[PDB]
Amino acid sequence: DKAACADGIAAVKARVEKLAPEAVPQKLKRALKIAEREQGEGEFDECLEALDDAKRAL
Amino acid sequence: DDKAACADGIAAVKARVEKLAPEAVPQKLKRALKIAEREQGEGEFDECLEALDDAKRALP
Structure with a gap:
């Protein structure tokens, strides 16, 4: 999840x-x-939600 | 789709x-x-994902 959050950002x-x-x-x-x-708080799972x-808005 | 995953992955x-x-x-x-x-520039988005x-895999 940590890598997916960084990659997604x-x-x-x-x-x-x-x-x-x-x-x-x-x-x-x-x-x-x-x-x-959320990434800054280490909530990488929630980062993916955001x-x-x-x-969706792309 | 593969087009979006290819751009996001690059x-x-x-x-x-x-x-x-x-x-x-x-x-x-x-x-x-x-x-x-x-491959992205050629619309070969599936092959782009393979590359x-x-x-x-090669990153430290």
């Missing part, structure tokens, strides 16, 4: 870098923020 | 590689990542 960040700032959905930006915080929501 | 391997000392990045990783990116598996 990298994957979401890469998608966001290609989008126009106004074209980044608010739901995507919030979900990624939650994932990065990452699922982020990808 | 992004994930690139971020892992950026954390390593350059001398610790094996030639086997570099070749596999190059193949994954070429990404080789790349991640």
